[PDB]
Symmetry: D2
Subunit: 428 residues, 4 copies
């Protein structure tokens, strides 16, 4: 449209405001009618359920912003949606909508996915403060109710707290996204669109788990065991740990995954191939011995995110008074050794600003390893579904090519293209 | 008006949104042209500056609520405003307005005062969730920007956090108030308008200071020394300390103030009349706390900012906390927490304690809006105990009880321990 | 001994100091050679393994205190010890002794049990400050190494932290106990010997779990779900929740257990009988009932089989404290450090909290006391008389006791499960 | 003596144990008779009060350790003591002794000073665990009562907590020191005696104030304003801030002091020089503007040790002032507990933080070193050799020392103010 052409030309705010908002737009989405299609199936191929096509543009609520999405990224919640697992997302959309008012727009026969993105503001509701058409933004997933009392103690704790594009519609894997003003932050000027896009969900989550006072809250000198360290979450967890003056010990399962974590500066590396009932107890003793060997003590904090076997082990190997922080699901390993387990996901608007400030300074860098065009977004989802990636897989949306969107080139030069892209061209 | 009549009659939501909003309303307020009137004056008599008259009704922003105010209260920020101290509130209003957009409405030649209240919702902006016309509400004063990151970590810490009716316009000492929806909580059903109205600010403030994890965070068994315990803050502080299993020790400056403090179940009472001089007075105070309570205080609760603040620092136990709004600091490893107000989360927690009757209102007097200036003066001259309420649109006392069975179970006497009490 | 008589007649400091220390003392104990006696045995009857007899008086270490034990209590760890489950305690004693030095003494062919007690100091080591013979004390179980850096941030967190009479020898189910000076607090004067001895382990455990900043850290207004509320841990938990202005909700499995919990001031009560993939559904019905009774989902779930249920029912951002896409916390805890035990002791001293004592046996009958706990026939706490010849002794503040009331102090007298 | 000869030549544990303890030792000390000597004197030259001479060797308490001191350092409390200001330390030594028992030894007509040190264990009390003659230690100043409940929640918070060599006798500025075993940590092997000795007091202090959960507790990204950045505290403050991913902003008052701070990796620097309580508000205004220009926002933590009022003003809403308007926290702190000291020691052991040593004096010239600190001529820390006859000794892991490099470990060598 004239609007996308104006955004891509980087036109003035008055030009953007003058260009008309189109009636529909191109979006990676699911269809309600397909919710049951994988009923019998062992391998729920994500490419079978995913559609790319025109969906209707919704009316903007007063506290919402319409964002022309330049790039987005694949997340695991995207893979789960497309699998319809473990409950199809249309159930979440109906729940959302039972609130009434503006929330009823979320209940549609279609669901636009995508929980991250970078882009350009094109419209704001009349209750939106500061943001204007033309502004470069990042969007993080915490879609919350600022009227709820719990939100004012912790953005993540509200009963209405939702993940954008997973439990809400109008997500990022599209030409346009609809978001609350409290999901928006200024784009780090020195990054490309795709670079900026891959961070908010994964880096924010890791930040909450590790740095923030609402998580493990590490300190310099802590030893941190990081499971699945070469993936999206582990890639930022390694970086926050080094930056904080901690000592990361990564667990990987392959030569290539080992190479990825070394690229992020994790030199203490354990290969899962030594080992991974009574065998869980034993394996834990093996693991604990290796951490002491490599780092000097048992870990102070264990970081885990599969929710599989690694969770039980985490509890075993954490030091007495240690903390396990987790995402995804012998009593004496808990109470006898006085340990703590912190269940965490996402991050509130304050934490995401803190995470952003760390990218704005270059203290932390994006974990982008691959870029797919929006026309190939289904295959990028499959690649994440089959664990063929290290770090993050970005998707160009409205951006017609890679390398666009840098508005502080001098800074980018100072920091270094390669420093900024440690995982470029790497896979699993 | 037909709107006020509809509200006062207990009409349906339909009836309320059918009744037109008036273009002016009656409000206790200050005039910009008067900000210099106490230049040179010793007694800055609030009755000289405070005006009661009609003021233009503003347009409602998307996230705002027009509240028909039933009852309000006098707070010390109200007194300070009327004194144009320490800076005229008009400087805060112009700073507010520099944000632009909807904030420009706050910069007027008039300032409608009032920082808490109870009332009935009459209009809501198109971005307001859940609230509807006819809903019984309380308003607390945390007027904050929900778009700011810091707000989602602690409502009080945003750059744009303001005290309603002090750093914003359209406060509660008026027939109507304009509030952000994140200032609203359901009214406790068993309370009258005036009872409900006296708490949010002072009780909220003490909650954050004493109970919340953002303040001193008392535990059962803590000894808490409470300066100026008979006033608005201390009345609620005594309640939170007892409710949580703590041991309150009150400081008062008269027999009638002692009576008020005893009325709230504080039985350990110290009179000021018992007293480099500061260092000596401090050791005297610490001796008395050990006599009465068994150890030095764990937390000291301070709020005049006068001599009590140096003393607090002295008498707090090693590793202790002074909450307020040289070797005694670092050698004894003490903590000072500066605080005021309360965020929307703390205010809800405070509301739930009033809702179950675990704590009760500290209302001691009630004035009609026609006499609100004299009520302000009573507070300025410290002739009150607890809280002074102001009836706004409520035409008499005792209205607004919508849970009479609960009220009767708690005891109307139990709900009003400070009834009829004064400081003189 | 002339020592036991002097203590009982309430003699002087000098008189206790003049009376010699016998070379053996009477003690409830296990034998290392018995460790295998229950092999292939389903009911591990503790009456079969518990011995009552003479054991020799060990040498006193510099930082230790010899306590003439007036009363003790039964705790879960005594039962487990007497079953030799899951590992015999003789393995623990041996691990202790490996330190060398003074720890060597713990490695014995016998094991004197007992983790709480009350009594009278009779000897102090040359490195012990303040305490002198004649002093009335309670003893709590935290036997810690004050040389470890960890101990100086949190007494429970040292690698050498051990439970007295479980992982150490010379426990409190005997006429005397040897403790480290940092296990000692003054006895609440208004209480009898048996009343004071029931609390330290269980009330300190609950204090850390609920009150302390090292646990879930309740505030007034919190809804706290308490599993197994009529037992020893649960009896103090209810009391701390109520005293801190919280709202307790108790789960019980019988009508007499509901009786014990209501005696302690818990008016919101849930029977375990009101009620794979069925864990989630059972979660939903438990959560519905808590909202029905208390008004909201619980802020804290106090757990000690039901761990997974506790995780389901806690609110978003809630806490599950346990002793054996959500935002929940789980805190594993046992014991209490010396600081938390002193804070606990002060709540008993003011009468804000009362002992959970329900029954009393002489030391002659402690194996039966141990069986009662083993078979879950108690509510609250079972006391054992050690050197005290009768109940009712050791009150040294009569006017406070009359004021608080013997009744109020004994809400669980004679009750059973 | 033959003991000191054995220590210096590297004799075995049993050889140390066998060489007798001398009756007197050489110590830097104050005399009680001199306590009025500066009446009406403005410049209380510490070189007039300080004596170096033989003093009697005390009896060793069961929980104590005798240390042959290889090196020590000057601290502000040493200066203050030698000035008898504001109160003669002899008044602390009497208050201490008032506890009785083993504390009586502290009340003497002399007072040996020195609050940190490194050296070699020579004797242990019968209650001391693990340590052996021959072991290389550092000593930190937290002299604490391990029996008091508070110690077990936080080592610094007990009523009996004292500064070694300042509120206790038998300090580090002598050939021997007497310490509690709870003051000892293993010596970082790659360091010299003198390098290891300068850190424990100041580095532990800054650790508590900034890294620990008992102080300001910085996170990566925090902007920290550091007043008087070039001194002993500020030198370690800068290091911890950088190592924790924080952004330090140093305030210095001369170009030489600016040189010291940049040698420690602080790139953001403000000169004091740049300019009623309305004047402190105005000075606050310009300060805050300078921090925003250099760092990007107002400071999250102000590290303060005249400037207190300014620190309160410049802190952000919700910010912290840590010290040794409407929503701010002020944390008073000094020292570090035994746990914080070990965490501090661990960052030295890895090379993450380096000693802040700027100069070395022999014990013979220690009064001169004290005058240097009294007159603020120093940057960082001044070390004193005690039993070590020369510099460069005491490294026992020279491979790590080579990896890290002598210059990296000594960024402030040869510098002054």
């Amino acid at each position: 449209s004239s609007l996308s052409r104006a955004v891509l030309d980087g036109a003035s705010a008055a030009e953007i405001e003058a260009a008309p908002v189109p009636d529909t737009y191109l979006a990676l989405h699911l269809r309600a009618e397909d919710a049951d299609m994988f009923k019998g199936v062992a391998d729920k191929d994500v490419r079978k359920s995913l559609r790319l096509g025109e969906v209707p543009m919704p009316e903007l609520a007063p506290d919402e912003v319409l964002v022309a999405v330049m790039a987005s990224s694949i997340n695991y919640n995207t893979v789960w949606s497309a699998m319809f697992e473990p409950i199809p997302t249309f159930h979440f959309l109906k729940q959302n909508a039972r609130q009434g008012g503006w929330a009823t727009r979320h209940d549609q026969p279609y669901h636009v996915l995508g929980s991250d993105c970078s882009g350009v503001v094109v419209r704001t509701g009349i209750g939106v403060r500061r943001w204007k058409p033309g502004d470069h933004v990042i969007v993080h997933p915490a879609h919350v109710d600022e009227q709820e009392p719990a939100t004012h103690g912790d953005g993540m704790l509200g009963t209405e707290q939702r993940a954008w594009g997973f439990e809400t519609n109008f997500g990022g894997l599209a030409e346009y996204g609809v978001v609350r003003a409290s999901q928006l932050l200024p784009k780090p000027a020195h990054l490309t669109w795709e670079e900026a896009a891959v961070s908010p969900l994964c880096a924010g989550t890791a930040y909450r788990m590790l740095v923030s006072d609402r998580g493990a809250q590490m300190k310099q000198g802590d030893i941190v065991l990081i499971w699945g360290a070469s993936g999206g979450l582990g890639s930022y967890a390694i970086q926050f740990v080094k930056n904080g003056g901690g000592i990361p010990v990564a667990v990987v399962s392959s030569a290539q995954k080992e190479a990825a974590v070394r690229a992020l500066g994790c030199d203490l590396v354990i290969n899962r191939a030594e080992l991974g009932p009574r065998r869980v107890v034993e394996t834990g003793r093996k693991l604990a011995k290796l951490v002491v060997e490599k780092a000097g003590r048992e870990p102070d904090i264990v970081f885990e995110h599969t929710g599989r076997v690694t969770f039980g082990l985490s509890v075993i190997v954490a030091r007495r008074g240690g903390t396990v922080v987790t995402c995804g699901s012998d009593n004496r390993y808990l109470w006898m050794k006085l340990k703590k387990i912190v269940g965490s996901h996402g991050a509130n608007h304050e934490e995401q600003q803190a995470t952003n400030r760390l990218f704005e300074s270059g203290a932390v860098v994006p974990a982008m390893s691959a870029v797919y065009p929006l026309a190939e977004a289904a295959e990028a989802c499959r690649v994440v579904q089959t664990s063929r990636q290290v770090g993050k897989v970005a998707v160009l949306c409205m951006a017609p090519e890679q390398g666009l969107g840098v508005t502080d080139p001098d800074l980018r030069a100072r920091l270094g293209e390669d420093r900024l892209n440690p995982l470029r061209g790497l896979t699993a």
